[PDB]
Design a protein around this ligand. Sequence first.
Ligand SMILES: C[C@]1(c2nc3cccc(C(N)=O)c3[nH]2)CCCN1
Length: 191
Amino acid sequence: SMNLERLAENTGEFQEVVRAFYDTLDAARSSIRVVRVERVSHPLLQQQYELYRERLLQRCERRPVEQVLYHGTTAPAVPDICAHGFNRSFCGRNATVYGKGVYFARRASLSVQDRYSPPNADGHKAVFVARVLTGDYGQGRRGLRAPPLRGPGHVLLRYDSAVDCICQPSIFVIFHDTQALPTHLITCEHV
Ligand SMILES: C[C@]1(c2nc3cccc(C(N)=O)c3[nH]2)CCCN1
């Protein structure tokens, strides 16, 4: 099993991944076309992620502890994410407004913007689909190196993730190597 393989279009899995992507494209639904879908395989990261998930299901209060989220990226960054997973140390110096972590969107309409998934010379855009252990979340801010502090009224000292808004979150920020698993890569383009 190779790290990146084309997903056959005669499968229920292909139809389900494409339907969830279109369901959260909002105003961009009629201007985006799917070119192909690929399955990501990283056996060591998947096994380490599943152990973290089991621990969170036993400890965490909020349900669900896991969410399916989107991550737009550049064409040259694709092989490194497939081979090693997501890495907060490569966040860069620009626009880390909710901390030095890896950023995920609840809605495909955010990650499909050219500022997050810029097209290559052939017009193709890269958007990963990932299983993310969001658990209990707190407010994100610039300079965070780990999730924010819980404060008084809690035994645990830090949250599991950071967000843009604590009431209706649209962006989640992750600060641990085994807390997000890339499962699919959607290649898309402007109609
Ligand atoms: C600009 C930055 C980023 N912010 C995002 C907010 C929502 C979605 C994504 C995404 N990639 O789909 C974001 N990426 C932060 C540090 C380097 N990437």
